[PDB]
Amino acid sequence: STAAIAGSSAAEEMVALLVQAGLFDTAISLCQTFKLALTSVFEGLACKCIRLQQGGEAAQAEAWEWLAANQLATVITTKESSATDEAWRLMISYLDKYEAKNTLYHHCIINKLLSHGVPL
C-alpha cells in the first residue's frame, strides 16, 4: 500500500513511510539529498531502541533482521549483546558518520529515550 502511495507522492511523504516501516538507512540518505534534517531518522532509531529495552521476543528477532538490512560496521562475539544491543551500536555508528549540529541529534535522542524513562 505504501508502495502505491510512494508511486504518487513527494520527498517528505517518502521519508515518513520509510521511517514507519523501519527502513532507516534509506531515510537517512534521502534526507541528506534534499538537505532535509536528520532529526526524523534519529528519533525513529531511538524509538526502536526504547521498544527493545523493554520488549517481547518476537520484536527482538525482527530487530535482528532489520539490522542486516542496515549496515553493522563490525562483528562482536559477545553473547550478552543480543539483538537489542546490536541495534544500539548501529544507531551510534550512523550518528558518528552522518553528524551535523550536535545540539539537534543528541537532543532528539535523549528526548525520545525519555519516552517513559530510562537510566542513561
Next chain:
Amino acid sequence: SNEIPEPLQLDFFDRSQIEQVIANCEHKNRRGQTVCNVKLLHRVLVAEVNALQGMAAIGQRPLLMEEINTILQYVVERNKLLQCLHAKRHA
C-alpha cells in the same frame, strides 16, 4: 504404488534428530490420525528457528524459511500417502 521422496537436507540441524519430531507429528489425534495439526506443527517449526540465535551471520534467514516450507510439504505428503495406503487396504 508408493512414491516417498527425498530425505531432509538440514543446514544447521541434524537429519537424524528431525525423526523425533516426525514421530511427534505421527501421534494419533484421535484414531488413525497420524497428522498432528498443521496449525501446531507450523507454529512449532517457526519458533524453532527463532530460538536458534541468528547472530553475526544473519544473512541466511530466507534460506532457513524455505527449508521450513519444504519440511512441511514433505510431512503433509507422508501423511497423505499413509492415509491412501490405509484406504487401499480397507478396499
Next chain:
Amino acid sequence: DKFAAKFVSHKISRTRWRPVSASSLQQPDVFATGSWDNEENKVCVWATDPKQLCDIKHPGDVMDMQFLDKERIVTGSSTGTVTIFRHHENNQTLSVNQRWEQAHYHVGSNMRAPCTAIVCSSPEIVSVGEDGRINCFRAESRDVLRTIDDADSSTMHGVTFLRTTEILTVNSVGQLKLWDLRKQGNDPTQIFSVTGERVPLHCVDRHPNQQHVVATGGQDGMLCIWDVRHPMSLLNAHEAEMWEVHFHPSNPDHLFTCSEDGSLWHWDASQLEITNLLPLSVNSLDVLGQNLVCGTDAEAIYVTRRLFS
C-alpha cells in the same frame, strides 16, 4: 587365552618388532615400545609374559617409532627432534647416535612443533610434521638434504614411500597428496580427496606387494581402499576414530585396525571375516607372521604368539 597381558606403568603409544632375516628361519622375538602422556617418557625393548630387556629416557614424547635396521631405531620426538638410537646387543644398552634438533619448527614464531610421522628406506629418513615441512635426511649426514617448506598449511599426520623418491602424505583437512622428491618445486603432483567431506585422516598404509593399493583411516572409523592409479571401496567398520591400520607383511590378505573404543579388529580376505581379538584405547599394533603385539592406554602390553591358531 592367546593374549598374555603384562601391565606396565606408562601408556604405550607405539609397538614395533625387530626386523628378522628372511633367509634364516628364525621367529621374531624382540619388539620395541614407546610411551606417551607422562612427565618422563621412554623407549623400551621387550622379548617374548614379555620381559623387558633395555630402555632409555627419551626426551619429550615418542610420537612415531620405526626400526631402521636390526641395530638402529629411529624415533620422532614431540619437540620435532628426529633421533637415532644404536642398540648394543652385547651390553644391552641403547645409545644416542645422531640427532637433528630443529628438524621441525613452526614458521617464525618461537617454541617447538611436533613431529607426527616418520618413514624409513635405508638410508633415507623422511619426516613430516605439524608445520608444512617434509624434511629429508640421511643416516650419516649432519645436515638436512632437502626441505619442502610450506608444503601443507594444515598439520600432516602420516607419511609412506610410494614407489621410490615419492611420498604419500595425509593432512588434517582430509587430503592425500602425492609428492615427488626429484622435482625441485614445492608443489604436490596430485591431491586425492573425498568430494564434499573434510574428515581428518589419521592413518595410511600401502599393500606390501602391489604398490597401487593404499588403505587409509579417518575420524569416522571407515576403511577407505584407494587406487593411486585410478576411493575404490569405502568400508564401514568402527564407530570411532581409527588410529592405525597395518597390513600383515608376510600374508597381506590379513589386516589389523585399532580404534580408541578398544577394539583390535581383524580383517581376513582369504567375504571379509571380521573378529575382535581383544575383549581404554588401543594406540599401536605390529604383526610379523604368527606374532602380534599391541599397546593400550591402560598401560598394558598384549602379546600373542599363536595369532592364527
Next chain:
Amino acid sequence: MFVARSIAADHKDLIHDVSFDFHGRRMATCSSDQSVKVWDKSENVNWHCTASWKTHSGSVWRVTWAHPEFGQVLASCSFDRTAAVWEEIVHWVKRTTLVDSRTSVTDVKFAPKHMGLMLATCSADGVVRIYEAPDVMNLSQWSLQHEISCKLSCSCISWNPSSSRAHSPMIAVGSDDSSPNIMGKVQIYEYNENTRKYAKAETLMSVSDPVHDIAFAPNLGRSFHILAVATKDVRIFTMKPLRKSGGVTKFENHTVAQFDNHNSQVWRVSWNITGTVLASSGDDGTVRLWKANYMDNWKCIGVLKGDGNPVG
C-alpha cells in the same frame, strides 16, 4: 606427598603477588623493584624466566590473567591510578592504560568469558568501573560502559563464576574503610537487563568489620551461592535466591561458618578448582585449609610453619 621446592627467585626486591594461568603452566611474578617476570614451565617441572620488564612507578597490587580463548592477555593495577593491558608480539607490549579512576585502583578482575572481555576496576573513591573491549584483535581500544558508585572505599571485587542464564551477572564489592559504626561492608550488585544498569541487590550487614578480601565459590549446579569474606575472622555465607520480574530478586542470607582459629586478621581467601577446599592466610604466618565433610561441617585440615615445614 607434600614437597618443598626452592626456586631461586632472581628478584632484587620483595615479591608481592603471583598468579597462575588458566591451564596451570604460566605464572606472573610482580615485585617491589617495579618489574614483572613471566615464568614458564617446561616438560620437566623446572621453571624458567622468559620475559622481564618494568611496568609502573606506582606500587603494583594485583595481576590477572585472562582466559586463553582471548589470547595471552595480562592486567596490572597500581597505586598511580592506572590499569595496563599487556600482550606479546610474535616481549610484552602495553596496549592501553585505563586512567578514568581518580583514586588508587586497588583490585582488577576479568569478567567470566561468557560475558566477554570486560575488565573491572575498583578504586578507593568508591567507584567500580566496568570497561569492555569491542574487538579482541585491537586491544588498545577500551570503552567504559558501567560505573557503579558504592559510597564506600572499595577494597576487593569478585565476579560470579556461574554461567547459568538464569543467574544474572553479579559482582561483589567490599569495603576496607575502618568505619566505627557503619556496617554492611559487603555489597552485592546485580545487573538488571530492563534498565541496562547495575543495581544493589543485597548488603551483608553482618560484616561490620573491615573487609580485606571476598571470593565467590563455583556454583557447581546448585540453587544457592557461596561467598567467602575475609575480615578479622573467616566467614562463609549462603545466598539463596527467593521465589519468582521488574527488579532485583531479593536474597536470604545465612552464616554457615565462622572461623576465628587464625586468632589474627585474615588477609586472603581462595578456593580450589572445584570449590571444596578454601585456604586462608594470616598474621601468624600460617595457611589453614578448610574442608567440609559429608555432614556439612567445616574443619581445618592443614597448618604450615614459617620455615616452610608443615605443622604436625
